[PDB]
Design a binder for this molecule. Sequence first.
Ligand SMILES: Nc1ccn([C@H]2C[C@H](O)[C@@H](COP(=O)(O)NP(=O)(O)OP(=O)(O)O)O2)c(=O)n1
Ligand SMILES: [Mg+2]
Ligand SMILES: [Mg+2]
Length: 428
Amino acid sequence: GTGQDRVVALVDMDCFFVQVEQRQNPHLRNKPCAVVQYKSWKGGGIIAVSYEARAFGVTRSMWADDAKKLCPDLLLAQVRESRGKANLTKYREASVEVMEIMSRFAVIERASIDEAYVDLTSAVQERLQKLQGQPISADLLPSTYIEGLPQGPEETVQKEGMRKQGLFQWLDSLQIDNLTSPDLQLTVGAVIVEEMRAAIERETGFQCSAGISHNKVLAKLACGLNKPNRQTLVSHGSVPQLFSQMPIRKIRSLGGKLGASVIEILGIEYMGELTQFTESQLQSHFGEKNGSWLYAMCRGIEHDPVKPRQLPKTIGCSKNFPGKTALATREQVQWWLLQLAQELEERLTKDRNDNDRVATQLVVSIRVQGDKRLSSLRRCCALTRYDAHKMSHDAFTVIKNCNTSGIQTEWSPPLTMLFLCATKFSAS
DNA sequence: GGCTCACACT
DNA sequence: AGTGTGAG
Ligand SMILES: Nc1ccn([C@H]2C[C@H](O)[C@@H](COP(=O)(O)NP(=O)(O)OP(=O)(O)O)O2)c(=O)n1
Ligand SMILES: [Mg+2]
Ligand SMILES: [Mg+2]
């Protein structure tokens, strides 16, 4: 309960969608490159950006036309379009390539299309018994940064010189004859993550970064400290200095309104300033669960488990119809429900063959023009047959009384979003 | 900005 | 069963 019981890693692919396209098209490699969807509006919306393009200021959610003003040589790859919508199939398949490799090492929790947490606690005990008392060379950690090192009293004017000196200070001081030390466990964790990152790159051509620490939140934070193509070890001891200047919003789950209340109500900026408040005081402001979570977390302690889940629990297809393009006829709503239902059907049949399960509930969601909320409305029905016409007709049946227009041909208010989601999966 | 996913709350 | 937050 100093939050040092587990070794947890978070592995995240570098500029993932870009790398998928660069692997396929060698002309894009080692260049300023972005991935875009819907090429016809302002050149497309950027969804992923190479490190070479980031150095010109190009970011996610820029329009390509705009990104081209910062980087005129920027190269683009377009997301596949099918039935009038962006289709992410090539990136989900590439994801499967990566997840299957990691799952050879340990139990993973698929956290996104491009990252997974790894509980390495057992793999570490077993690796610590294999090298009996035998030390750990820097050569086993060729890409690892030890966060908060080097410290104290040429080389270190270069990034690779600092990395090494810190690693050397860390290793020089490790107590290897003691198999229970949390720091030693982390070190062996990092060795394993080197091997995992090497296998990923060898087997896929994709580079990634990772964090190694005692829990998910720290592992995720660590990962991003030395992107791209590097891994970062955040020990329990590094936490006070690390947290002392770490904006609250950088910690996973605190990037939104909760994080903002924490800052506003308590009158603080940094994760470390949370240590001054009693658990009861945090619970008073933020509730029993969040207050307890904050109190532990600001001291580097979190217990959320790496869940044994490699598969998504829901399979969704959605499309926005912004501004003037909002859907305004019954016929038009039906046609799009059908396009969504067809893609979903293909994805479900594949899921059923691959993963030996079937979805049993269909969720329909919409947004009406005028609504401020991402969803105006969710309704659900039975999913008894992977049949796109049935699924489309059922989703229409379920929403059609949201229609204010008595003309019945027309649809009001116009719809700015449709979403179909298969959920409540059972084995078969 | 657009297409996804997970989960807490009621 | 339905809504809202947070992430990637
Ligand atoms: N808002 C977002 C964030 C991510 N994505 C997709 C595209 C990203 O390549 C992929 C993984 O997201 P990410 O890990 O947050 N960023 P990415 O892998 O591109 O770069 P780094 O992790 O190297 O920064 O999810 C998206 O489509 N919309
Ligand atoms: Mg990534
Ligand atoms: Mg990611």
